[PDB]
Predict the structure.
Amino acid sequence: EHPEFLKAGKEPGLQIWRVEKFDLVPVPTNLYGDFFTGDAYVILKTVQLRNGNLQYDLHYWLGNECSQDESGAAAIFTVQLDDYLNGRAVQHREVQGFESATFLGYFKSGLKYKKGGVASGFKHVVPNEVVVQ
């Protein structure tokens, strides 16, 4: 067994992963682009300058339907580890509505609002923060 947060950074290009109670779950490659507006997604983008230097770009997608407790958590684990990956990296926050140009460029049709989740997909229910009451 091995840690995932530390696994990130094993290949250049762009990688996508979905956070789940601190479990990280690779978004189904079959769909590639589907997103549930309620949780938080983390993406990295290692670009190639001339032919040796590389730059990882951080991009967390928030359908604006996810609580801030989990939203920031992703921006935190994604940002902190980023420093653990390169030390700086780029920071991009997409709160569904005003994304960045690089994000809308790599995700042209990567925008599918699907209310649901992964483990709660069997019951088909979207518990609201009211649960804490």
